[PDB]
Design a protein around this ligand. Sequence first.
Ligand SMILES: CCCCCCCCCCCCCC(=O)O
Length: 133
Amino acid sequence: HMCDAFVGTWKLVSSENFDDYMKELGVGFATRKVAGMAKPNTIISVNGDVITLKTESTFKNTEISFILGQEFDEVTADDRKVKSTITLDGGVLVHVQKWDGKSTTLKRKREDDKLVLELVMKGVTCTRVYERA
Ligand SMILES: CCCCCCCCCCCCCC(=O)O
């Protein structure tokens, strides 16, 4: 039940400020050029308490599986080794990543028929809108 609203196959339809977000992350220029053009699919599924989130794109795929509230180690699309915790607060799936004394947040919520992803690092806010494939 908990994450039913998120389950599905979602395709990126719009993005704002992703370059600036990737810059704050430390992603290099070649990767930023590729990744700025990517239109990934995100596939969210659930098996009991275990949530899986796949991100697929031409250049790079990632997958994480997790239990809400339980820290896990993640290797990000840009090769960071982070400590991740994901919680569900008021319909918002909140993913925090911590590494090397830094933090970023990845927050997903439903907005009408869309899935909206907010990516925050320092002063940068990026907004990614996904629609059902
Ligand atoms: C899509 C290629 C991304 C490659 C490098 C940037 C990685 C940044 C962290 C990933 C942020 C998630 C973006 C998303 O799911 O839309």
